[PDB]
């Protein structure tokens, strides 16, 4: 059963998603962002000492 | 309160059809129908 | 045979699929416990038992 949602990028925020299949009882998910990391791409130019 | 000739009496004095005795279904509230003694 | 009075019909879920995708619940008032012959009087819906 395909589904889609949008959740905030805030650390520790207890996001809850609701899935409502027409033939089954509703379900609730809990997703939490414990930790993020932004990785840039680097090119070395020179070294100074 | 004796049940009919085609009815079975649970130990709670309730009457259920004989065809429901030992059918693997707990028809009686006290499972008298599925009791081991009655089913043998 | 048990005497059935005040019989109402409600549907929990419906999904017109190839398999038996419909759950039906009946509320009634009776005097004894027995067996009834359940039938549907249209070919739009086919019962299972
Ligand atoms: Ca039984």
Short description:
Chain B: Residues 1-40 form the LDL-receptor class A domain. Chain B: It is found in: Cell membrane; Membrane, Clathrin-coated pit. This is part of a larger assembly, with two copies of chain A (49 residues) and one copy of chain B (40 residues). With 49 residues, chain A is an all-beta fold.
Description:
This is part of a larger assembly, with two copies of chain A (49 residues) and one copy of chain B (40 residues). With 49 residues, chain A is an all-beta fold. Chain A has strands at residues 15-19, 27-31. Chain A contains no helices and two strands. Chain A has a two-stranded antiparallel ribbon. Chain B is an alpha+beta fold and 40 residues long. Helix content of chain B is 10%, strand content 15%. Chain B has one helix and two strands. Chain B has one helix at 36-39, and strands at residues 7-9, 15-17. In chain B, β1 (7-9) and β2 form a beta hairpin. The radius of gyration of chain B is 9 Å and the shape is globular. Chains in contact: B-C. The B-C interface holds B 15-17, 19, 27 and C 32-35. Bound molecules: calcium ion. Calcium ion (CA) binds next to loops of chain B. Chain B: It is found in: Cell membrane; Membrane, Clathrin-coated pit. Chain B: Residues 1-40 form the LDL-receptor class A domain. Chain B: Disulfide bonds join 3-15, 10-28, 22-39. Chain B: This is Very low-density lipoprotein receptor.
